[PDB]
């Protein structure tokens, strides 16, 4: 039964901002056992196992299959983030530029609230349950033997629509928010005395507050639109 | 079987812990002590013993239903039967509890991920074995508390964002408005009676 | 789904509120002392700060009661929707 | 029957730095390091130990009227009685303490939760059992505790705060002002005689 | 919830008073002598900081000790009140 | 009776490490780590095992009074009386370091505390007894260790306001001054002999 | 001998990946993330990520040749001896790669440096031992990704170049000109399709 | 007595990484990181790594002392002998090693710290036990590894320094040179050939 | 040090090429492929 | 609480002295072109912090030194 | 302080050579031209500027060992 649980656990740790350290490790590790005593059922395979298992390389496999999903469904989650942390940088986060400071704190400010809400989006339809059942389409398609990875050398050499997405996301807001540096540049040009600490940060500010409410209704669509298409990317992932 | 029963004594109150309750009250008390700044409160004691009788708080009907007709008897003086209707009872108990809380689409999802329950096309829920159970009610219990968790995490985030808005716009770049945020959040926890009206809301229309 | 999108949209405009108001002031008063750094120009660097500061404290301390109010109300509505959240 | 009071013994003691104090103490103290900058003391080290100390400190007259009536036979060399008023009048006093820092609310709240206090009729605060008043208790005084740490934590924010409206007000925007607030900072906690009053102030009138 | 407001409005009046001196001290002086950057203009760069150093160390100098008084007070205040605040 | 010695024994070195040393020099090393700029030592290494070398070292006379008159006998090989004087002896040499440095303030406040001091009316110190005397001991040594590290704090903080002022003197506004004053801190640190003259400070004319 | 094998096995999954690999990958996407302004990945999450990913991938030749002479043996099927030859072959396999890729330079200073080759006077390379081999490939490995690193750097460093020039050629002196910097880099980033052929390169590039 | 050296071999290696090396390389390559910006490399994998390398690496020659004198027989494969000139000859080359890089200074004013010593009044280094020897050696070591550092720190300021000096000149106010000084780093961190010689030197110099 | 001399030279004439402003920025796109070829010639 | 202002106005003064020789020798040549400049005002600065800097160090040094004598004073 | 003292003066020397020649090379229209001088500084005087902090940076380091 080992096998599908280091399917599982990579699962669940490798996927934390749905399932993280926030849940105490006590929790962590009996949902493994959980899962996969559902799943590994009807798998009634009753031979002799090698000395010192030599199977174990078979145990290389499964740990890979289980990191894949994770970082490819936190394309979704990160172009919401990526969305948000650039967004953050014309107003006030890209002051941490600077030679190493204490902790990465401007990742807090805005990103985080991205990162609940489509967190908490997932529960209407699933959180954790299309990774699953895309998970055993995996298990249908490799449940397990010495051919252990099939392709996935060249299937980890992709491409991820992360900005794309993002861009897809922010566009207005990027273009009116350089408009709005230039017209912080024309404010200079009428009086060449403005030190832009002494005037622009405030009114960047309030407009990328502003902006972010209006593209967060649109964030609600186009999540729904991007969810489609990270499910067509596992689909073909897996299968190849 | 009495073995079973007294070794799982020693053992199983920590798979319950991963049963049943104590997974949302935890949840939401870490949710609670990552605002405010540092843990606050001991991760080892405090938040987990709260959980812990809470719990059992929780749980004493459907031990009361299992008192009435499982524990009265094996009470080791009265060296009562192999638990059988025990345990079949209680889990009608628990299975009410667990159906009160578990979505379907999870339930056929994990049966068609047992390769089990696929085959054998169970209809009712009750017919759902514990076993199987167990992952669909954890995952959906799972969703109800990172809903309830993010939805009380709101005002925090925004006391953060509005004291880094107003020192942004001051042009306080160098700032760690966390600490700032830190008093401000509290005030509505406590002066809005949330802490105990939280406990009340979770816990009484949890089992209603 | 919609729910989610009505807190969001909510919450972000308590956002608006609060960090509307300060971030306002501290904008007319660096631009009303950048018109002043006109003619009789007199810049050296920073001035316009202070009043900056002066802008943001009288801010606290003139919003300051009702701002908590509006906190309390939706904080409180929060939890009532709380038991239709699940 | 011996047996119980040795177990519930090895349990208990987690039991009861979760249940009367122990809690502000620990709050505070971080809320105290929070400020400062860094930890600037050993989390894994010394504050919980100063917590601990304090703790059975601040029990000491519970234990004192135990002494007289439950603690100074249990000493094992007395051999003394099976133990029902010892559990009785130090449960009278834990109960006196509990409700003179429990609020009613959150065991009205927990009684609906229970259904326990639903069916079994408590009427009295002494008739709800002690099980039912640990969680409140723990709620009342994590409210109680964590507004006094934060109406603690604001003037150092301000002394924070002026700082860096110093700094930009010359314009010295790329700085850490907390390392200049370090000094200050420690300097009032000092000329305050703030800790001192802090730990005599939670102590004497947290019991008297 | 209207001490709270009670307590930030005294927090805000305190940091108004102890903000309010020092910063007017370098305003007065940099305001003077941007003032002699006009009519007679030379205008460099930064020569009125030198003479704010003078007034702003004079004024870490001789303002500081009562200043930390004021915390001094409103801080005594809250240990006592900490047992009227549970 | 040994086993409530060796038990404690095992128990106790934290407690130590928390009881008359360690807090000083722990506590003036984060303060010398929080200049510099990073970390620049490892936390979780370094400036903790610093810690536990110096602090038996500082402790070595009064391990010495313990070695003479308690620990040498508790060697097995000398199978000792069984621990009367063992104790109460090297709790007076632990009271008179206590009473070496703690405050009377805390004392009191402590006493009124305990509501066992209110009670048994103790007027001497040495009446107070070690449990009682502890903590006070640990806030007092705390303060003094403050007021040490901050009193050193200082000088850096006029170095990076030098540089600054410089630097926005010429007008260079965009800068990291930290990075600057990295290397010229450290030279001061050492040219000093700062880091010999201060261990030797905190060691010499603590224990005298 | 399980037993040392399965706890270096608990213990060198680190070491090894501070062995060939992790190094370059972490460097390059680390600089890459140094431009384009904030992090704009998480730290914490992705981008070390791919670094282990590749790493895994470009480790498995190694595993492929003792997949056939290794991995492929212990079987029951095969009837293989206890793990003798097993780590010599590997070690021999992993000894060819590390010698591809170890300096001669650092590979004497640091025999003489443990003073065990020094004294013992080591020939071949392959009578280094894997312990003394491991630094001075990491340090040869370090140079390389640093060369390759800051030749990435060198475009977003122009691009704000020529941002500043704009500036301050149109009398635009006060401005944050990064901010600017974000979008188009972010832009080009994607408009020439580089971050694909960057990780592309990088894996096969270095392995095939 | 074979049990106290086994439990503190599983106690002592981090007191040996605390007590001979592993602190002036760690110290170096956080120094060495601290320049070209960013962390540059991981903080929780490699520099620290490299040390241990290099740590154990660099240890062996004491170990080759003991390997004639010590080592060859605790390999438990020997059945060696209980620990008398084990303890004392690898005492002695440990004190020859200390005393090669120990000041007297700190030895006196440590010597008063330990009172014992005051109260013995030792005069040769040899009768300095090796507790009394452990802090003065960590104290000597943390000055000569900060001079060293720092002094590697220079070069890179002084860049820093010159690309703002030039931005300034030019009137070009606005900039952050730091990212433009990332890459002339590097350069010079390899166009030295200067990482070899800097472990070459720290190498030798060290051990000889 | 004389390949950063070159590299310097071909983004600082690329620098003079730009100080017409929408499709000057174009011109950076073409250079920035061309820095990622003669990335792998940098080791 | 008097000694320690005390020992703060100590501080203060050292970096009023430090503080104000270069910022005068500045202000001179800000004066006198102004009645370009910053090229003038660079030279003065740069050789400030050569010229001045051993002895203005070994303020600093001095004092830095009774530091720490009456740190075991300061218990 | 001796060595200290010493490594510091050099390191200012260093840095007034390095600080001193660029306005030499530069010795609204005519600014623009000027910017080129900026940047054929980096084209003509970088590697053998290189190769002054270079020998000194490595005596430094040999001289590292002495320096303690």
């Given at each position: 039964?080992?096998?599908?649980?280091?399917?599982?656990?990579?699962?669940?740790?490798?996927?934390?901002?749905?399932?993280?350290?926030?849940?105490?490790?006590?929790?962590?590790?009996?949902?493994?056992?959980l899962v996969?005593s559902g799943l590994?059922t009807?798998?009634?395979?009753?031979?002799?196992?090698?000395?010192?298992?030599?199977?174990?390389?078979?145990?290389?496999?499964?740990?890979?299959?289980?990191?894949?999903?994770?970082?490819?469904?936190?394309?979704?989650?990160?172009?919401?983030?990526?969305?948000?942390?650039?967004?953050?940088?014309?107003?006030?986060?890209?002051?941490?530029?600077?030679?190493?400071?204490?902790?990465?704190?401007?990742?807090?400010?805005?990103?985080?609230?991205?990162?609940?809400?489509?967190?908490?989006?997932?529960?209407?339809s699933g959180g954790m349950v299309f990774?699953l059942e895309?998970?055993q389409?995996?298990?249908?398609?490799?449940?397990?033997?010495?051919?252990?990875?099939?392709?996935?050398?060249?299937?980890?050499?992709?491409?991820?629509?992360?900005?794309?997405?993002?861009?897809?996301?922010?566009?207005?807001?990027?273009?009116?928010?350089?408009?709005?540096?230039?017209?912080?540049?024309?404010?200079?040009?009428?009086?060449?005395?403005?030190?832009?600490?002494?005037?622009?940060?405030?009114?960047?500010?309030?407009?990328?507050?502003?902006?972010?409410?209006?593209?967060?209704?649109?964030?609600?669509?186009?999540?729904?639109?991007?969810?489609?298409?990270?499910?067509?990317?596992?689909?073909?992932?897996?299968?190849? | 079987?009495?073995?079973?029963?007294?070794?799982?004594?020693?053992?199983?109150?920590?798979?319950?812990?991963?049963?049943?309750?104590?997974?949302?009250?935890?949840?939401?008390?870490?949710?609670?002590?990552?605002?405010?700044?540092?843990?606050?409160?001991?991760?080892?004691?405090?938040?987990?013993?709260?959980?812990?009788?809470?719990?059992?708080?929780?749980?004493?009907?459907?031990?009361?239903?299992?008192?009435?007709?499982?524990?009265?008897?094996?009470?080791?003086?009265?060296?009562?039967?192999?638990?059988?209707?025990?345990?079949?009872?209680?889990?009608?108990?628990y299975k009410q509890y667990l159906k009160k809380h578990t979505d379907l689409e999870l339930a056929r999802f994990f049966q068609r991920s047992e390769e089990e329950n696929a085959?054998l096309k169970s209809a009712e829920n009750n017919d759902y074995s514990l076993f199987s159970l167990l992952p669909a009610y954890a995952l959906s219990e799972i969703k109800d508390?990172?809903?309830?968790?993010?939805?009380?995490?709101?005002?925090?985030?925004?006391?953060?964002?509005?004291?880094?808005?107003?020192?942004?716009?001051?042009?306080?770049?160098?700032?760690?408005?966390?600490?700032?945020?830190?008093?401000?959040?509290?005030?509505?926890?406590?002066?809005?009676?949330?802490?105990?009206?939280?406990?009340?809301?979770?816990?009484?229309?949890?089992?209603? | 789904?919609?729910?989610?999108?009505?807190?969001?949209?909510?919450?972000?405009?308590?956002?608006?509120?609060?960090?509307?108001?300060?971030?306002?002031?501290?904008?007319?008063?660096?631009?009303?002392?950048?018109?002043?750094?006109?003619?009789?120009?007199?810049?050296?660097?920073?001035?316009?700060?202070?009043?900056?500061?002066?802008?943001?404290?009288?801010?606290?301390?003139?919003?300051?009661?009702?701002?908590?109010?509006?906190?309390?109300?939706?904080?409180?509505?929060?939890?009532?929707?709380?038991?239709?959240?699940?």
């Amino acid at each position: 039964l080992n096998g599908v649980f280091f399917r599982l656990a990579p699962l669940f740790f490798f996927l934390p901002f749905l399932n993280n350290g926030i849940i105490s490790p006590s929790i962590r590790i009996p949902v493994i056992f959980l899962v996969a005593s559902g799943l590994i059922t009807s798998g009634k395979v009753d031979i002799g196992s090698s000395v010192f298992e030599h199977v174990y390389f078979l145990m290389f496999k499964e740990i890979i299959v289980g990191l894949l999903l994770s970082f490819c469904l936190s394309l979704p989650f990160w172009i919401f983030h990526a969305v948000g942390s650039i967004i953050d940088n014309q107003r006030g986060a890209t002051l941490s530029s600077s030679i190493d400071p204490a902790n990465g704190v401007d990742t807090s400010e805005l990103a985080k609230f991205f990162n609940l809400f489509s967190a908490v989006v997932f529960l209407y339809s699933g959180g954790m349950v299309f990774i699953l059942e895309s998970i055993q389409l995996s298990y249908n398609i490799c449940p397990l033997f010495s051919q252990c990875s099939f392709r996935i050398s060249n299937i980890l050499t992709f491409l991820t629509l992360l900005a794309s997405q993002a861009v897809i996301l922010a566009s207005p807001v990027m273009i009116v928010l350089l408009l709005s540096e230039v017209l912080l540049g024309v404010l200079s040009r009428f009086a060449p005395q403005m030190n832009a600490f002494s005037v622009s940060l405030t009114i960047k500010s309030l407009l990328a507050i502003f902006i972010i409410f209006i593209c967060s209704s649109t964030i609600y669509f186009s999540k729904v639109q991007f969810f489609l298409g990270e499910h067509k990317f596992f689909t073909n992932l897996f299968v190849r | 079987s009495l073995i079973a029963t007294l070794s799982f004594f020693t053992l199983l109150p920590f798979l319950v812990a991963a049963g049943t309750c104590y997974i949302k009250f935890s949840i939401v008390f870490v949710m609670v002590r990552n605002a405010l700044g540092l843990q606050q409160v001991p991760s080892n004691m405090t938040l987990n013993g709260i959980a812990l009788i809470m719990a059992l708080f929780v749980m004493k009907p459907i031990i009361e239903a299992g008192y009435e007709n499982y524990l009265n008897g094996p009470q080791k003086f009265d060296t009562i039967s192999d638990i059988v209707r025990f345990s079949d009872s209680g889990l009608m108990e628990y299975k009410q509890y667990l159906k009160k809380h578990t979505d379907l689409e999870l339930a056929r999802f994990f049966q068609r991920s047992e390769e089990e329950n696929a085959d054998l096309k169970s209809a009712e829920n009750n017919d759902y074995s514990l076993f199987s159970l167990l992952p669909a009610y954890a995952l959906s219990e799972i969703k109800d508390a990172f809903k309830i968790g993010f939805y009380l995490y709101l005002p925090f985030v925004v006391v953060d964002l509005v004291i880094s808005s107003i020192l942004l716009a001051l042009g306080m770049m160098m700032m760690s408005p966390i600490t700032i945020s830190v008093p401000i959040k509290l005030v509505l926890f406590v002066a809005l009676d949330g802490w105990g009206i939280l406990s009340k809301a979770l816990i009484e229309q949890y089992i209603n | 789904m919609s729910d989610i999108v009505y807190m969001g949209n909510k919450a972000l405009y308590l956002i608006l509120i609060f960090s509307l108001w300060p971030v306002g002031i501290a904008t007319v008063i660096g631009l009303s002392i950048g018109l002043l750094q006109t003619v009789t120009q007199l810049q050296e660097q920073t001035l316009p700060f202070g009043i900056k500061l002066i802008g943001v404290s009288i801010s606290l301390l003139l919003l300051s009661g009702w701002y908590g109010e509006v906190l309390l109300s939706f904080c409180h509505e929060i939890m009532f929707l709380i038991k239709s959240g699940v």
